[PDB]
Design a protein around this nucleic acid. Structure first.
Ligand SMILES: [Zn+2]
Lengths: 486, 493, 286, 128, 125
RNA sequence: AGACAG
DNA sequence: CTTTAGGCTTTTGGGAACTGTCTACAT
DNA sequence: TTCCCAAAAGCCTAAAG
């Protein structure tokens, strides 16, 4: 049915939080205590380049225990949740100052920045805040100069409250003459349908995990886009951190400055930390760094076997089937789990009969299958046969064999040759996943995807076998038919 | 094996070059004179300071440099620096010198510095990591590229390109090449480019330029624009250089001429500068020629003594390399195997910047305190080393699982573009007339030795290459014969 | 101034402181014014112026740084952006899941510590856990359970496992203490909030690795056993507050400490019992 | 393949100070040996160092003689090389100007041994 | 003989996780601490997830990526491995009723970041 | 972003 | 006659293979 | 670095009050 974007009413999100709501307006900063509290709420800190030991902790690094789950820390008034499973919620909130009508939706700001903001002139800035300096004669363009002249002749008030209150007429004027000049129907319909959601009272400042500061020798590493966001929040702080209270015009100007900083931050972050080749959407949202996965050089078995048969070696079998071996050790022998891990890790680089028997019994207990179902990947993934299902059948007793006996027949489906190439192996942790992967099993690439009734050329026998068959069948071991009859 | 067989194999086998097999970087960096015990790096530093000494305020003599005692080396490496005597425990093969200046016979604070201290086989250890130092195959005085004459200076990396332009002579249209060169880095009505004749007219008057650089006169045969002003030249005193000047003049005038009202102002200088007023840039361009460039140009076959002589030679004698070049970018003969100029790029830049920012302040009296502050802010401990592992592409990481330095260690060459490596570029190396087959590879470099760095033969170094003093690639005569024939076939049509 | 611042640029540084930017300017202015213015012167111339111075101053302041070296802001340039920071976790989550599923049983772990433990004590401790799991777990309980159960369950896992696993391990440790004869400490296992010459010699023999100490006024001082300071920490934690006993009635009667008021009075000679428990653990381990 | 056996030289680096202390993996109850001597052979399970975080409150749990020999795969830091690999040499660096020595008494025998030999070597170099 | 002799095999039943829950790379000290490498191989890239989404329904592929991305799902997988009479041939690895979809860290981060901008991707009604 | 492996 | 719409030509900017290993990094 | 290719700018030409 599709997947479209929907404008979110920040007021509804603010009302549905129902927790500890702390606002960024009330950080006067300029002193150690408030700056440190702001750095605790913001600025996810990593003090040293070392692996942390707190699996479960509060916002503060004081409750290092994990049994205290859901306990509200008195220092922070925040419950203790798993660090890895920490909910991703807006770190702070920003409300309208005492002399500002409301806040403009950052999506609306970004949408209006594409058209209103121009190199020669900033239409949105001129329309919203008063402390904007411009020279009409300095406009080096003609279309922009005409747009500026028309806007000046129309004569709107340059206050944020006026812009918010009379947004309908201002937006209609922006539509009318030349100011956007394109996508008028869609943008007008969008404004007409979602008018109420474009001016929320409250605005969320994103999660602590969004912003990372890593302190180490030679300083504190940060990112570039985060900077913009920081400024935005700081701007709202400066709205209330004033010795002399600001006039309503100054408050509107500072609010617009903060909102523009937010819009620039979101635009830059979407362009850089999502859109780029390394990022979030194209790097983690569509697969990254599986668990229960191995990678090894493919050395195979030239023996009578099955095509859906794989031979994972001793070290790969021990590390990959770590918890299977732990379960077998605990079930059979009176061994604690610590002793199980010690035994398994101790006997990765060494051979014994017990763990080999455990592998054999695991593969046997995988009853309605040749072994343990798994997926095997060759890079780059071009064809259907680049990824194929196999069944693990035996860990190799030779510790020196860091090899993977994939079938000879399934070699041609990828471009796999035994010239020193490492391929990837993912262990299927479920029967449902094995049944799902059965659609990626090798018997799916037998029939050619480019010929109506022909078996794909990937099933052709390899070189040595074909040459053996030739030297056997095409031999003159009998006289011709006439001489044979006579 | 039969010892006599091995003896006969040795007799019937040409030996390699001990200059190249043991490490050419070793010879060009860590070789001591017998008369005085001084490394090649120390002598290079002295040469650089002696070149830059023209910019001293009459008394700031550069005495030289000494070798620092390991007592002082350790004391200087590990300083207090806010109550933390920080020391970096690592092999970090280095050695310390100290540069000493003198002012009116009295010593200043010596400035210590660190230097790589190459080992045999082009091997260094920096911060505990083993690096290989490869030479860079550089053009001696200037390179000729696809359509360009590329000349590097101590500061700038200039390129001389050319285009075509039209002018009317005796009422008939004629076409001449205009040679231009962008020099104002901030630079990056029809859009045109900074012609060399434009620089001539910006410095000297048009009539002055013509009289000084040719036996040609100017009025205001007849030369005129295409699509006002009239330049009349004596019927018999004509030259290609004068025609090129005319073409450049009309190239700069035809598109602009809203600032040309009275043609006599063309004989001035401020008008031309306005057309191009960064007099600091103009003065830097005028005094932008140094001794090393002059020596290299003399070696190549040019007689430059002033940058304007260089522009005249390019406009008249070296312009032949821009349209139909006798030499070719594809070859590798007549090239240097430079090591120091790329290793000490950081130090060269630091010395240049020190000299320029020291002369540009004032010409008044200099106090010892201010001189010491400038030396402290200019010549630090790791001036020439902070960027060795990140900014220099000639220092690679050693990953040789062999006892032989020839196969991977000592037989690596690096092209200039790959030598900088700060660009992080990929020219795709296919649509390039630079990477064409040439017989030079067979004598310089190793064909059939094709790493993914340079899949052609220029990536590695032929170990039998005849290289004379100062790292100039000489040509062995005998094989040259065969090589010559091969080259003809490579250009068979 | 513004312008210056613007111019310048701024740077870052500024921012550083915081602040914002705006404021610054104012402051510056104031310063210037114051310072310057015042112073110056014016016148013168010379011186210067014023313016210048213022311017220077403013420038210076603005620046400062320059001046112044540290505490400066540097914008790192980030084989992706989320995994661009080198900060890992010390423990694999699968190990923690395995330790949870392990600590969910008590009979096996208890027999791993001591084969000669009646199952009736285990059943009583589990029945008491069924009521005690509502309340909170306090540091002395965790410390004692870590001490008693390390031949079968790792100590550090107590800081990663869930609350039910900790309660079951407390039950197992209490059963082990009750069987061994240290009933007083066993009483202090499932609870709600509300060194002599011979001991020193034996503990030094059992724990030959002792913490070195600073020389006082130049003259070097003898080292102090780390087990001794651990015992002191446990003693202080137990004497920190008063307690309400939630455990087996038989153990409470055997403890020889009965109070009409619903308070668990700490015996005067409890540090000696803890020292005896640590000595027994040391003898069992080596 | 026996005729073609490559020789692999590897270096394992471990730091033990106030953060952690070496365990006992090559010595009995009487003799404490954190790592193999020069010319010694790594365990059948290639394990060296296995350093454990230093905590005083866990003294009667992770500092008993059995707990020092026993290696917990999680919560401990070992460096795992090829088993059966002969040790070529050992380089020891010691910061000797800390008044409270972080390593408790008893587990600094081979460390002090090799450090004394290296100190004599470098002192003789400096004297020359 | 050549280099690339092997010994770089990286089998890992479970990999240590960043504070922002996702498997990470191995630093030198933490990569030289396991018998054989314990790297989390990126066997599901864009091309691999393309092939999976097309050959198999997007459901199972999303389930695999949810088991990898969401730490709770991976913990459930390991718990199913450990708490089964047959560690091989587990009927269902993650009980989706107990652990619903949508808990994957990258997707939650993306949705929250969009919501901070005022937008959210949702299915058409 | 440089090299290497496929 | 004056004031904007329409379509063609310039200029600018994002983007350019997959997996794994290793290497670089304070003054 | 250099080639691809789309999207916004900018420009001459043309139609209605
Ligand atoms: Zn807290």
């Amino acid at each position: 049915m599709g997947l479209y974007a929907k404008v979110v009413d920040h007021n509804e999100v603010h009302d549905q939080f129902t927790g500890k709501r702390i606002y960024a307006n009330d950080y006067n900063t300029s002193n150690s205590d408030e700056k440190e509290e702001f750095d605790r709420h913001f600025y996810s800190h990593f003090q040293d380049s070392e692996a942390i030991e707190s699996s479960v902790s509060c916002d503060c690094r004081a409750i290092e225990d994990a049994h205290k789950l859901g306990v509200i820390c008195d220092i922070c008034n925040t419950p203790v949740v798993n660090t890895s499973s920490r909910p991703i919620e807006p770190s702070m909130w920003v409300r309208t100052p005492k002399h500002v009508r409301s806040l403009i939706n950052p999506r609306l700001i970004i949408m209006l920045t594409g058209y209103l903001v121009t190199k020669e002139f900033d239409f949105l800035a001129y329309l919203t805040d008063t402390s904007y300096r411009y020279d009409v004669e300095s406009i080096g363009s003609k279309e922009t100069r005409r747009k500026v002249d028309r806007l000046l002749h129309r004569g709107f008030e340059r206050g944020l409250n006026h812009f918010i209150d009379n947004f309908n007429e201002i937006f209609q004027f922006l539509l009318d003459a030349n100011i956007i000049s394109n996508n008028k129907s869609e943008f007008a319909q969008f404004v007409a349908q979602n008018k109420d959601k474009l001016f929320p009272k409250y605005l969320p400042v994103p999660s602590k995990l969004c912003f990372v500061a890593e302190s180490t020798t030679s300083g504190t590493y940060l990112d570039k886009p985060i900077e913009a966001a920081i400024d935005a929040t700081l701007t709202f702080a400066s709205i209330d951190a004033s010795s002399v209270p600001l006039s309503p015009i100054k408050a509107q100007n500072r609010t617009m400055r903060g909102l523009r900083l937010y819009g620039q931050f979101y635009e830059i972050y979407a362009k850089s930390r999502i859109a780029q080749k390394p990022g979030l959407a194209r790097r983690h949202m569509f697969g990254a760094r599986l668990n229960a996965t191995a990678r090894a050089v493919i050395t195979s078995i030239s023996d009578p076997h099955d095509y859906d048969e794989l031979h994972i070696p001793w070290g790969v079998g021990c590390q990959l089937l770590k918890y299977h071996l732990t379960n077998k050790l605990k079930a059979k022998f009176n061994m604690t789990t610590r002793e199980a891990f010690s035994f398994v890790y101790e006997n990765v680089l060494q051979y014994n009969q017990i763990i080999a028997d455990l592998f054999k019994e695991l593969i046997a207990e995988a009853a309605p299958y040749k072994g343990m179902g798994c997926t095997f990947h060759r890079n780059p993934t071009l064809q259907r046969g680049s990824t194929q299902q196999f069944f693990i059948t035996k860990v190799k007793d030779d510790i020196n064999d860091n090899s993977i006996s994939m079938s000879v027949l399934c070699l041609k489906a990828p471009n796999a040759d035994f010239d020193g190439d490492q391929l990837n192996l993912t262990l299927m942790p479920d029967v449902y996943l094995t049944k799902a992967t059965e659609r990626i099993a090798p018997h799916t690439w037998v029939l050619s995807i480019d010929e109506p009734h022909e078996i794909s050329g990937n099933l052709e026998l390899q070189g040595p076998v074909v040459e053996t068959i030739i030297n056997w069948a095409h031999e003159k071991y009998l006289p011709p038919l006439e001489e044979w009859l006579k | 094996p039969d010892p006599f067989l091995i003896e006969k194999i040795r007799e019937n086998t040409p030996c390699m070059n001990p200059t190249l097999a043991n490490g050419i970087t070793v010879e060009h960096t860590m070789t001591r004179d017998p008369n005085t015990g001084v490394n090649m790096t120390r002598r290079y530093i002295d040469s650089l300071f002696d070149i830059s000494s023209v910019l001293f305020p009459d008394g700031f003599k550069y005495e030289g440099n000494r070798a620092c005692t390991p007592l002082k080396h350790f004391e200087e490496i590990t300083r207090e620096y806010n109550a933390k005597r920080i020391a970096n425990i690592a092999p970090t093969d280095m050695y310390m010198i100290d540069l000493m200046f003198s002012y009116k016979g009295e010593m200043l604070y010596p400035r210590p510095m660190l230097l790589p201290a190459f080992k045999r086989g082009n091997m260094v250890t920096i911060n505990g990591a083993k690096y290989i130092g490869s030479p860079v195959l550089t053009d001696v005085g200037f390179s000729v590229l696809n359509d360009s004459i590329f000349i590097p200076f101590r500061r700038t990396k200039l390129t001389f390109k050319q285009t075509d332009h039209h002018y009317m002579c005796n009422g008939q249209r004629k076409i001449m090449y205009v040679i231009w060169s962008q020099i104002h880095n901030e630079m990056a009505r029809p859009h045109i480019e900074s012609c060399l004749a434009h620089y001539f007219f910006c410095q000297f008057g048009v009539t002055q330029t013509f009289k000084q650089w040719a036996n040609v006169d100017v009025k205001c045969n007849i030369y005129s624009s295409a699509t006002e002003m009239v330049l009349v030249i004596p019927r018999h005193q004509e030259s290609i250089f004068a025609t090129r000047l005319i073409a450049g003049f009309w190239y700069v005038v035809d598109a602009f001429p809203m600032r040309f009202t009275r043609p006599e102002y063309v004989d001035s200088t401020n008008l031309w500068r306005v057309i191009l007023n960064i007099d600091s840039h103009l003065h830097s361009f005028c005094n932008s020629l140094d001794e090393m460039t002059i020596e290299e140009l003399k070696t190549v076959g040019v007689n430059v003594s002033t940058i304007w002589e260089l522009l005249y030679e390019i406009m008249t004698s070296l312009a032949h390399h821009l349209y139909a070049t006798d030499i070719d970018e594809t070859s590798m003969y007549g090239k240097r195997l430079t090591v120091l100029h790329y290793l000490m790029s950081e130090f060269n830049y630091a010395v240049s910047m020190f000299g320029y920012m020291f002369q540009s302040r004032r010409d008044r009296e200099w106090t010892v305190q201010e001189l010491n502050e400038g030396l402290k802010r200019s010549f630090k401990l790791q001036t020439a080393i902070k960027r060795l592992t990140v900014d220099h592409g000639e220092l690679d990481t050693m990953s040789n699982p062999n006892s032989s330095m020839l196969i991977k260690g000592t037989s690596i060459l690096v092209t200039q573009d790959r030598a900088k490596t700060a660009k992080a570029h990929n020219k795709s190396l296919i649509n390039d007339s630079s990477r064409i087959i040439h017989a030079s590879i067979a004598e310089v470099g190793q064909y059939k030795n094709q790493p993914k760095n340079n899949p052609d033969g220029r990536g590695r170094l032929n170990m039998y290459t005849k290289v004379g003093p100062t790292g100039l690639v000489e040509r062995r005569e005998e094989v040259r014969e065969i090589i010559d024939n091969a080259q003809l076939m490579f250009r068979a049509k | 101034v513004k312008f210056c611042v613007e111019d310048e640029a701024p740077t870052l540084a500024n921012l550083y402181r915081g602040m914002s930017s705006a404021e610054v300017p104012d402051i510056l202015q104031a310063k210037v014014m114051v310072r310057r213015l015042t112073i110056l012167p014016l016148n013168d111339a010379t011186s210067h112026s014023i313016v210048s111075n213022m311017f220077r101053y403013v420038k210076s302041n603005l620046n400062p740084a320059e001046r112044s070296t540290a505490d400066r802001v540097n914008d790192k340039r980030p084989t992706s952006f989320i995994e661009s920071h080198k900060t890992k976790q010390r423990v694999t989550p699968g190990d923690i899941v395995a330790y949870n599923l392990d600590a969910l049983d008590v009979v096996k772990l208890v027999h791993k510590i001591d084969d000669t433990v009646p199952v009736e004590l285990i059943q009583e401790c589990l029945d008491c856990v069924a009521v005690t799991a509502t309340k909170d777990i306090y540091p002395h309980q965790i410390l004692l359970a870590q001490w008693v159960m390390h031949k079968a369950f790792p100590a550090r896992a107590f800081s990663h496992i869930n609350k039910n696993a900790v309660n079951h391990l407390l039950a197992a440790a209490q059963s082990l203490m009750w069987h061994w004869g240290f009933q007083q400490v066993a009483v202090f296992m499932q609870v709600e909030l509300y060194i002599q010459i011979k001991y020193k010699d034996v503990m030094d023999e059992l724990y030959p690795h002792q913490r070195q100490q600073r020389a006082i006024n130049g003259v070097p001082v003898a080292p102090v056993n780390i087990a001794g300071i651990a015992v002191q920490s446990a003693h202080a934690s137990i004497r920190s507050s008063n307690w309400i006993y939630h455990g087996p009635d038989r153990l409470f009667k055997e403890a020889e400490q009965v109070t009409q008021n619903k308070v668990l009075v700490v015996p005067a000679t409890i540090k000696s019992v803890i020292t005896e428990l640590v000595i027994h653990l040391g003898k069992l381990n080596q | 393949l026996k005729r073609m056996m490559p020789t692999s030289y590897s270096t394992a680096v471990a730091n033990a100070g106030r953060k952690a202390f070496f365990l006992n993996m090559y010595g009995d109850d009487k003799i404490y040996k954190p790592f193999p001597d020069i010319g010694d052979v790594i365990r059948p399970d290639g394990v060296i160092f296995a350093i454990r975080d230093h905590d005083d409150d866990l003294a009667p749990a992770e500092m008993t003689p059995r707990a020092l020999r026993t290696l917990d795969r999680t919560f401990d830091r070992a460096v795992i090389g090829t088993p059966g690999a002969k040790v070529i040499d050992i380089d020891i660096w010691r910061d000797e100007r800390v008044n409270p020595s972080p390593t408790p008494t008893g587990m600094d025998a081979q460390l002090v041994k090799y450090h004394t030999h290296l100190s004599s070597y470098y002192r003789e170099l400096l004297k020359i | 003989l050549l280099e690339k002799i092997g010994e770089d095999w990286s089998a890992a039943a479970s990999v240590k996780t960043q504070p922002f829950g996702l498997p990470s790379k191995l630093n030198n000290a933490d990569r030289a601490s396991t018998p054989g490498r314990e790297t989390a191989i990126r066997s599901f890239g864009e091309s691999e997830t393309r092939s999976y989404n097309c050959t198999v329904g997007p459901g199972p592929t999303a389930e695999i990526l949810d088991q990898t991305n969401n730490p709770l799902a991976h913990a459930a997988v390991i718990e199913s491995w450990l708490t089964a009479e047959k560690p091989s041939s587990v009927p269902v690895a993650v009980d989706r009723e107990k652990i619903p979809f949508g808990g994957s860290r990258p997707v939650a981060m993306f949705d929250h970041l969009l919501e901070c901008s005022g937008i959210a991707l949702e299915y058409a009604p």
